[PDB]
Every structure is written in structure tokens, then in C-alpha cells.
Amino acid sequence: ANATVKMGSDSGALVFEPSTVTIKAGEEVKWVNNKLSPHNIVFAADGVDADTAAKLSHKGLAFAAGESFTSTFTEPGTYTYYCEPHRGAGMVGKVVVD
Question: Where does it reside?
Fold first, then answer.
């Protein structure tokens, strides 16, 4: 039971897909770098703890299509993230824990 989301589409899209991905409370996720760089996956702590979101928040920088980060959803909620930098029109996509 895992969830993965490619950072962009093959064709050449920005928005992440699948926008929404099912996850389990305790499972991990993998965000493979597809394209559209530089860019990152920043997570906000709205309906979730700060520290928590922090971790979930990727303050890195993916450039090459190989370096993929990972996250862990302990609390059964709904984390959200948005590309701050990027070079288009932000991105839409969130996660959900069961």
C-alpha cells in the first residue's frame, strides 16, 4: 500500500498527477521527477500540524529525472502542497489518508 505522483506529465504539463492519490495512515509516498524544473513540493500546514507538515514539506530541489523524495502520512488527514517557484501557474494536487 503506497502512493506515487510524477512531478509533471510526460507530454509536458505542470499540474501534478494524479492530482489526488490514496494513502494509508503510516504509509509513505514517492514523488518521481518527471520534468518542469526547477521545482519542488512544498506542503502547507493548515488542517495539519506544523512540524508534521514541515517534514511533508519538500524544501529541496528536483532537477534531474531520477531524484525522488518521500513522505509519510501518520495522521489520517489531507495534506496539500503548491509549487512556489516553478515557471508557469503553480500546481494543483493533494493527498488523502485512509
Answer: Cellular thylakoid membrane
Please give the torsion angle defined by the CA atoms of residues 56, 61, 63 and 69, in that order, rounded to the nearest 10 degrees.
-30
* Domain span including residue 27: 1-98
By annotation, the residues acting in catalysis are 39, 83, 86, 91
- Are the C-beta atoms of 98 and 76 separated by less than 8 Å? yes
Contact 5, 39 (CB under 8 A): no
Known binding positions: 39, 83, 86, 91
Rounded distance, CA 31 to CA 61, Å?
A: 12
Cβ atoms of 43 and 84 within 8 Å: the answer is no
User: What gap in Å lies between CA 3 and CA 21, rounded to an integer?
Assistant: 6
Provide CB contacts within 8 A for 66, sequence distance 6+: 33
- CATH number, domain of 75, equals 2.60.40.420
**Total structural domains in the chain?**
1
